[PDB]
Amino acid sequence: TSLFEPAQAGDIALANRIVMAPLTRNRSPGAIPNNLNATYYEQRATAGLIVTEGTPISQQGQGYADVPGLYKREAIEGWKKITDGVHSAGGKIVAQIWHVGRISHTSLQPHGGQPVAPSAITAKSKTYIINDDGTGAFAETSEPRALTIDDIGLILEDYRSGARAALEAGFDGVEIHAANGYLIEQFLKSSTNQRTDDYGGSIENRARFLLEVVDAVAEEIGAGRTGIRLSPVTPANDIFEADPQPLYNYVVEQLGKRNLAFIHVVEGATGGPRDFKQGDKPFDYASFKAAYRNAGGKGLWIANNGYDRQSAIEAVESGKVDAVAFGKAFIANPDLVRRLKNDAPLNAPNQPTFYGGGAEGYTDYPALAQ
Ligand SMILES: Cc1cc2nc3c(=O)[nH]c(=O)nc-3n(C[C@H](O)[C@H](O)[C@H](O)COP(=O)(O)O)c2cc1C
Numbered sequence: 233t234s235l236f237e238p239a240q241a242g243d244i245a246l247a248n249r250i251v252m253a254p255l256t257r258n259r260s261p262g263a264i265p266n267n268l269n270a271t272y273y274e275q276r277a278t279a280g281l282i283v284t285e286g287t288p289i290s291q292q293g294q295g296y297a298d299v300p301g302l303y304k305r306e307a308i309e310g311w312k313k314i315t316d317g318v319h320s321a322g323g324k325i326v327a328q329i330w331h332v333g334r335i336s337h338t339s340l341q342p343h344g345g346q347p348v349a350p351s352a353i354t355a356k357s358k359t360y361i362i363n364d365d366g367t368g369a370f371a372e373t374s375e376p377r378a379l380t381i382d383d384i385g386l387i388l389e390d391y392r393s394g395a396r397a398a399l400e401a402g403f404d405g406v407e408i409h410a411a412n413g414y415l416i417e418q419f420l421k422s423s424t425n426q427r428t429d430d431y432g433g434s435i436e437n438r439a440r441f442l443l444e445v446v447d448a449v450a451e452e453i454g455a456g457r458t459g460i461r462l463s464p465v466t467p468a469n470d471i472f473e474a475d476p477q478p479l480y481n482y483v484v485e486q487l488g489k490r491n492l493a494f495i496h497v498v499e500g501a502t503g504g505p506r507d508f509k510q511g512d513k514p515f516d517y518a519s520f521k522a523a524y525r526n527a528g529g530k531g532l533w534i535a536n537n538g539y540d541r542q543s544a545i546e547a548v549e550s551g552k553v554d555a556v557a558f559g560k561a562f563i564a565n566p567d568l569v570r571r572l573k574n575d576a577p578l579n580a581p582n583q584p585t586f587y588g589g590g591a592e593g594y595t596d597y598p599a600l601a602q
């Protein structure tokens with residue numbers, strides 16, 4: 233199996249196994265994708281699969297400024313232009329449906345309310361907010377409110393609508409964002425979940441919310457078009473779990489029963505060391521993937537974090553992974569696939585232009601000279 237050869241992820245056919253990782257860019261003010269966003273995605277449409285930046289299912293689920301959502305009619309219309317452009321270049325694309333949970337700020341919340349979370353525990357994290365004078369800034373996340381079961385019922389509805397919106401927007405499917413210390417992970421991990429109801433305590437209970445979201449999304453659009461991103465040991469957004477193995481093995485066992493399109497795994501600290509660990513024992517990725525496969529899981533296995541060309545080729549050849557997702561490399565390289573194919577040099581990413589702004593450091597990264 234080669235990195236550059238076609239794959240299948242549920243009902244979604246991919247021209248190759250080079251994937252564009254989801255990348256929050258904060259360039260859709262008013263939660264609506266614009267013409268510049270459409271250009272940015274079109275440039276990268278040679279990717280076998282594009283996973284969009286995080287796109288929240290609600291304003292409640294928004295944690296960062298100028299992030300395109302799926303809850304406005306105008307946003308749906310804006311995404312349709314993005315998906316039409318990607319498809320015209322023969323690409324494929326899935327929306328990363330998002331809910332940030334406690335990673336948010338009152339200024340972004342409806343009614344300036346408290347961000348929502350399974351337990352009222354404030355993250356020591358930061359979000360990207362825009363001042364009235366336009367300047368972007370990083371600010372401490374706000375105090376969260378503990379969700380009730382009714383709140384949870386409402387969020388589940390927002391997922392159904394979100395998924396429905398993505399289909400209406402012309403997306404090939406969705407990736408459920410269950411990674412990087414956001415809402416779903418907040419339920420999953422012990423440092424964020426101190427609930428005493430059916431959503432707290434045991435592994436089964438902590439995974440309950442994740443599985444409801446998956447079942448809700450898949451019911452709406454098809455299991456064959458539903459994927460999910462996981463990050464077993466990431467320290468992103470002040471989150472921690474002492475026993476990731478039993479928890480995460482149990483999760484993929486359940487996902488293995490659900491005929492999903494893909495499992496997308498952040499290996500290690502998100503944007504950090506691949507060999508990061510939480511708790512006493514190092515995470516066992518082979519045992520993890522085995523739990524998925526052994527439960528019957530046929531989803532395409534997409535791995536991410538700190539991969540380069542050679543390691544990506546070897547990862548796929550060995551059969552450890554089915555496909556590789558690149559984040560920063562795809563920021564810097566619209567034509568990343570061609571460059572990898574021909575082993576051409578790669579542009580360096582400009583970290584100061586990751587978030588907010590305009591075309592600079594977004595749509596002005598050069599393609600190869602041809
Ligand atoms: C600017 C930037 C924005 C990101 N936004 C998201 C996001 O919205 N959702 C997500 O799941 N991961 C996001 N990530 C994480 C990446 O998808 C990926 O996990 C990380 O960049 C490590 O991959 P890499 O070594 O290929 O760059 C973001 C990373 C960067 C650098």
Ligand SMILES: O=Cc1ccc(O)cc1
Pocket residue numbers: 256286411412502
């Ligand atoms: O802005 C960085 C970022 C990283 C991971 C996510 O899941 C979302 C945003």
